[PDB]
């Protein structure tokens, strides 16, 4: 569940935080609207784990595996079992056109998988629709990702919050003018060159189920009006996700540790961990 009030923790012993030592001297760890930007070295996972365990937190994870993409499911699920929200309740939602092609994978206690029988406009619509049909009653937080990926390292409760976006690996060090936002004023996704905090990737976002429903519905509705006007945003649902998060500031921002492609972009020093990466 998601309790209204602060959790009362048991006695815990861990290293004291040091006020006169920054946790990172190389990166920004809080946004100008006071949301944490999640990097290795910013959190004590034992404290967070206990906070979330006490609320009996359930996390849903959606992926779309259509056509040849069903081929990525086995690696995705096996690595999720090793690295995603381990120790917590997880409900995987696999959207697919080939239920019989979904691999048999052994799941840990408190973890389960549902197959949902079935383009970017549609993904937003479908997520929103299934939030209303079932995710709202079944999980507390919903995380939405691409299937052609593998977990290489811990991705846990540190990301959970009402609404989060993830820094796109191509733009985390770029000025706003370089971000590939939709730039036509006719588009619902329009952002001019003097606006923008970050460029978020469409491949990893989430939050409470209700905030995710709201984001995905808003993006779908915006795509529909754009379509009526003969417009398709330059990067489709990702352009709309960016517009949504510009106006509705996320309560956490995930660093590119959470979405990387080592083949394309190597391994810059600011990344102490590569947690979730593209599969060749």
The entry of Cl ion, a copy of itself, ligand GTI, none near residue 130 (CB within 5 to 8 angstroms by kind) is: none
Among positions 27, 35, 48, 265, the unique one binding ligand GTI when judged by CB under 6 A: 265
Q: Which helix (H) or strand (E) holds 141?
A: strand 141-145
Residues across the chain: 280
Is residue 102 within 8 A of residue 64, CB to CB? The reply is no
Is residue 166 within 8 A of residue 253, CB to CB? The reply is yes
- DSSP-derived letter for residue 31 is -
Question: How near is the Cβ of 169 to ligand GTI at its closest, in Å?
Answer: 4
The entry of Cl ion, ligand GTI, a copy of itself, none near residue 169 (CB within 5 to 8 angstroms by kind) is: ligand GTI
Among positions 124, 241, 259, 271, the unique one binding ligand GTI when judged by CB under 6 A: 259
Q: Which of the stretches 10-18, 88-96, 127-135, 144-152 binds ligand GTI when contact is defined by CB under 6 A? A: 144-152
Reference 120, options 189, 190, 186, 176; nearest CA is: 189
Among positions 2, 40, 42, 278, the unique one binding a copy of itself when judged by CB under 8 A: 42
Q: Which of the stretches 6-14, 122-130, 253-261, 270-278 binds Cl ion when contact is defined by CB under 5 A? A: 6-14
Question: How near is the Cβ of 172 to ligand GTI at its closest, in Å?
Answer: 11
Question: Cα(169)–Cα(185) distance, rounded to whole angstroms?
Answer: 26
Q: Which of the stretches 46-54, 65-73, 141-149, 190-198 binds ligand GTI when contact is defined by CB under 6 A? A: 141-149
Catalytic residues: 238
Question: How near is the Cβ of 120 to ligand GTI at its closest, in Å?
Answer: 12
Residues that contact ligand GTI, how many (by CB under 6 A): 11
Reference 257, options 65, 27, 71; nearest CA is: 27
Q: Which residue has the tokens 């036509």?
A: 184
- 21 touches a copy of itself by CB under 8 A: yes
- 196 touches ligand GTI by CB under 6 A: no
Is residue 181 within 8 A of residue 199, CB to CB? The reply is yes
Q: For the residues of 42-103, what is the DSSP string, one character each?
A: S--HHHHHHHHHTTT-EEEEEEEE-GGGGGGHHHHHHHHHHHBSTTSEEEEEEEES-GGGSP
Residue 226 CB-density burial (10 A; 0-12 exposed, 13-18 middle, 19+ buried): buried
Question: How near is the Cβ of 10 to Cl ion at its closest, in Å?
Answer: 4
- 27 touches a copy of itself by CB under 8 A: yes
Among residue numbers 198 through 257, which ones bind ligand GTI (CB under 6 A)? 203
The entry of ligand GTI, Cl ion, a copy of itself, none near residue 117 (CB within 5 to 8 angstroms by kind) is: none
Binding site for Cl ion (CB under 5 A): 10-11
């Amino acid at each position: 569940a998601i309790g209204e009030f602060m959790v009362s923790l048991p006695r815990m012993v861990y290293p004291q935080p040091k006020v006169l030592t920054p946790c990172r001297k190389d990166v920004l760890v809080v946004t100008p609207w006071l949301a944490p930007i999640v990097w290795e070295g910013t959190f004590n996972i034992d404290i967070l784990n206990e906070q979330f365990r006490l609320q009996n937190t359930t996390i849903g994870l959606t992926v779309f595996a259509i056509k040849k993409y069903v081929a990525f499911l086995k690696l995705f699920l096996e690595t999720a079992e090793k690295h995603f929200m381990v120790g917590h309740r997880v409900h995987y939602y696999v959207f697919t056109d080939q239920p019989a092609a979904v691999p048999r994978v052994t799941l840990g206690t408190g973890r389960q998988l549902s197959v949902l029988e079935v383009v970017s406009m549609r993904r937003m619509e479908m997520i929103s629709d299934f939030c209303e049909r079932r995710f709202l009653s079944e999980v507390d937080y919903l995380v939405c990702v691409d299937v052609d990926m593998e977990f290489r390292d811990h991705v846990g409760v540190e990301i959970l919050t009402p609404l989060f976006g993830t820094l796109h690996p191509s733009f985390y060090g770029s000025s706003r003018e370089a971000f590939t936002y939709e730039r036509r004023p006719q588009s619902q996704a329009y952002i001019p060159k003097d606006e923008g905090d970050f460029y978020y990737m469409g491949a990893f976002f989430g939050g409470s189920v209700q905030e995710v429903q709201r984001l995905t519905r808003a993006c779908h509705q915006a795509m529909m009006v754009d379509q009526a006007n003969g417009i398709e945003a330059v990067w489709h649902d990702e352009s709309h996700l960016n517009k949504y998060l510009l106006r509705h500031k996320p309560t956490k921002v995930l660093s590119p540790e959470y979405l990387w492609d080592q083949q394309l972009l190597g391994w810059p020093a600011v990344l102490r961990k590569l947690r979730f990466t593209a599969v060749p």
